[PDB]
Amino acid sequence: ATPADWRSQSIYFLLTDRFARTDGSTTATCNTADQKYCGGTWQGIIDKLDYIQGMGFTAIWITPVTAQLPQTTAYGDAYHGYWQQDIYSLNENYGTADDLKALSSALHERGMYLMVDVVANHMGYDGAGSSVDYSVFKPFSSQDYFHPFCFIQNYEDQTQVEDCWLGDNTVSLPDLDTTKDVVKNEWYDWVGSLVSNYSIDGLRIDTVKHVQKDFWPGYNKAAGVYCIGEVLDGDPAYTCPYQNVMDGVLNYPIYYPLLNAFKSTSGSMDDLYNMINTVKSDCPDSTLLGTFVENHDNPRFASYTNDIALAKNVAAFIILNDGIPIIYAGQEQHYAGGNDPANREATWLSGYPTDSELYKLIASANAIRNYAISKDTGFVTYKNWPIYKDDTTIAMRKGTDGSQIVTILSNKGASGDSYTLSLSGAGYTAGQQLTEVIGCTTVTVGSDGNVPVPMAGGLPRVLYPTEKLAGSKICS
Numbered sequence: 145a146t147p148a149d150w151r152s153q154s155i156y157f158l159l160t161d162r163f164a165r166t167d168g169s170t171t172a173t174c175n176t177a178d179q180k181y182c183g184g185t186w187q188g189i190i191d192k193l194d195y196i197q198g199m200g201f202t203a204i205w206i207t208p209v210t211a212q213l214p215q216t217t218a219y220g221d222a223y224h225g226y227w228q229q230d231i232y233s234l235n236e237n238y239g240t241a242d243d244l245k246a247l248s249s250a251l252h253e254r255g256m257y258l259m260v261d262v263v264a265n266h267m268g269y270d271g272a273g274s275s276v277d278y279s280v281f282k283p284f285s286s287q288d289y290f291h292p293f294c295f296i297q298n299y300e301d302q303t304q305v306e307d308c309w310l311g312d313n314t315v316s317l318p319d320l321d322t323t324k325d326v327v328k329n330e331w332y333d334w335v336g337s338l339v340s341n342y343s344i345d346g347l348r349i350d351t352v353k354h355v356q357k358d359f360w361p362g363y364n365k366a367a368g369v370y371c372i373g374e375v376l377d378g379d380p381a382y383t384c385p386y387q388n389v390m391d392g393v394l395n396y397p398i399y400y401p402l403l404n405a406f407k408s409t410s411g412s413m414d415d416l417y418n419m420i421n422t423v424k425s426d427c428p429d430s431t432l433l434g435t436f437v438e439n440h441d442n443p444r445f446a447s448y449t450n451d452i453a454l455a456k457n458v459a460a461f462i463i464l465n466d467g468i469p470i471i472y473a474g475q476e477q478h479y480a481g482g483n484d485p486a487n488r489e490a491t492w493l494s495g496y497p498t499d500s501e502l503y504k505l506i507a508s509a510n511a512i513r514n515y516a517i518s519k520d521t522g523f524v525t526y527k528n529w530p531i532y533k534d535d536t537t538i539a540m541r542k543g544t545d546g547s548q549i550v551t552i553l554s555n556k557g558a559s560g561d562s563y564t565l566s567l568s569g570a571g572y573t574a575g576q577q578l579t580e581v582i583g584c585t586t587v588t589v590g591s592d593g594n595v596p597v598p599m600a601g602g603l604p605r606v607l608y609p610t611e612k613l614a615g616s617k618i619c620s
């Protein structure tokens with residue numbers, strides 16, 4: 145599917161090994177500290193598609209599918225999919241080629257998209273860099289396809305970052321020489337084939353800053369579908385420019401300020417407001433970035449604060465910001481694991497309750513987003529604009545004038561006092577009735593165009609014109 149098609153989607157990101165088993169168990173042991181395969185499979189994802197769609201997601205991102213190193217290393221099994229050895233075969237721990245195909249067609253039947261994570265930067269090996277046996281890799285069976293062994297000592301030296309090896313002496317990640325034409329040619333041919341064989345709709349590309357920029361334009365074109373890249377860097381002057389060589393990138397620039405604003409009642413709304421504006425002006429297209437606050441490489445939000453009102457607000461931001469929303473499986477169940485491996489918890493242990501607090505908030509936020517784009521073909525290309533901020537509040541506006549959504553977010557927390565915010569700048573007309581779509585109550589615009597928003601419990605408030613909800617099932 146193209147970049148234009150993808151602007152309207154919302155993604156549920158999951159680790160195949162940790163989401164759902166074929167036997168549907170909700171109590172099978174999965175101690176994250178063991179770093180072993182816990183048993184998730186592609187068939188299990190199919191069985192729980194109602195759980196996922198019920199939150200209003202239109203797509204899923206799944207970790208890498210290729211066959212991995214077989215060993216249990218000192219860092220555990222390659223359950224996460226990032227240590228490949230044979231790119232022409234699939235990881236059998238998750239099922240067969242037919243299962244993968246079954247998945248794509250079960251998604252498509254429901255009007256949903258499939259996004260697959262891919263690695264071009266490196267392969268994986270159980271042992272020290274000097275001792276690698278290149279004959280185990282397929283098809284790159286020789287040391288001549290790879291860069292000479294070196295580890296990345298200085299992450300500020302771009303040359304080292306691209307030409308030296310990620311990993312270490314325990315689990316080493318042999319780095320492909322992506323400047324060689326044989327390497328380019330093989331990867332360009334594989335990526336088009338993988339996409340056509342499994343009917344994939346879009347790709348998440350790992351380790352993009354570790355491969356020279358000029359490789360990417362031809363990979364994105366060979367893939368023929370939207371590519372969103374992982375560039376792990378918080379500086380918009382470093383990451384955004386990658387949008388000149390690939391459709392989109394993950395929004396790490398917004399991640400830092402967003403987490404800092406909501407992880408405590410003293411978080412800064414100023415840093416978040418300024419970064420929204422910077423990304424808006426300085427990235428080639430903000431509407432093609434992926435917004436997130438949790439993933440498998442950082443502590444979960446609840447490891448920072450167990451306050452449920454702060455978790456509601458950060459989740460509302462993610463769905464309603466510019467770009468594509470991305471929630472990480474377990475976020476909706478309020479999971480609190482710390483750094484890898486503790487943030488790779490098995491979703492099934494939660495029992496998949498559809499009446500959890502964040503499951504409901506997410507469902508309501510995705511519901512208004514999905515309905516609005518149904519009615520306003522400009523919603524996805526209108527650039528989100530922060531219209532107000534104070535020490536504990538930020539409010540934003542997105543959507544064509546007359547149909548705009550106005551979202552009011554707070555970091556006061558679950559103890560927050562009850563008061564009335566008089567919000568200016570919303571753009572609605574005098575006397576207009578508005579529905580607050582999270583708690584389903586109504587508010588009326590004052591005669592001077594200001595909106596009297598009832599604040600309490602640190603809850604987020606999402607406003608939309610009552611007349612426009614006509615015929616919808618929202619707040620019915």
Ligand SMILES: C[C@H]1O[C@H](O[C@H]2[C@H](O)[C@@H](O)[C@@H](O[C@@H]3C(CO)=C[C@H](N[C@H]4[C@H](O)[C@@H](O)[C@@H](O[C@H]5[C@H](O)[C@@H](O)[C@@H](O[C@H]6[C@H](O)[C@@H](O)[C@H](O)O[C@@H]6C)O[C@@H]5CO)O[C@@H]4C)[C@H](O)[C@H]3O)O[C@@H]2CO)[C@H](O)[C@@H](O)[C@@H]1O
Nearest residue numbers: 219224226299311315350351376377378379440441484485
């Ligand atoms: C040492 C670890 O080794 C393995 O760790 C695994 C991991 O479990 C697996 O998931 C995969 O890991 C994946 C890989 C490798 O295929 C890459 C992508 N993620 C990578 C980035 O592609 C890379 O750039 C670097 O990312 C660096 C970044 O390049 C550097 O700039 C700084 O990032 C800065 C950023 O520059 C700055 O702006 C901001 O303020 O601070 C952050 C810390 O640190 C980051 C690491 O924390 O590491 C990330 C984990 C993926 O999302 C990630 O899941 O492989 C690694 C390496 O074997 C073990 O399993 C772990 O238990 C063990 O603790």
Ligand SMILES: [Ca+2]
Nearest residue numbers: 306319354355
């Ligand atoms: Ca490299």
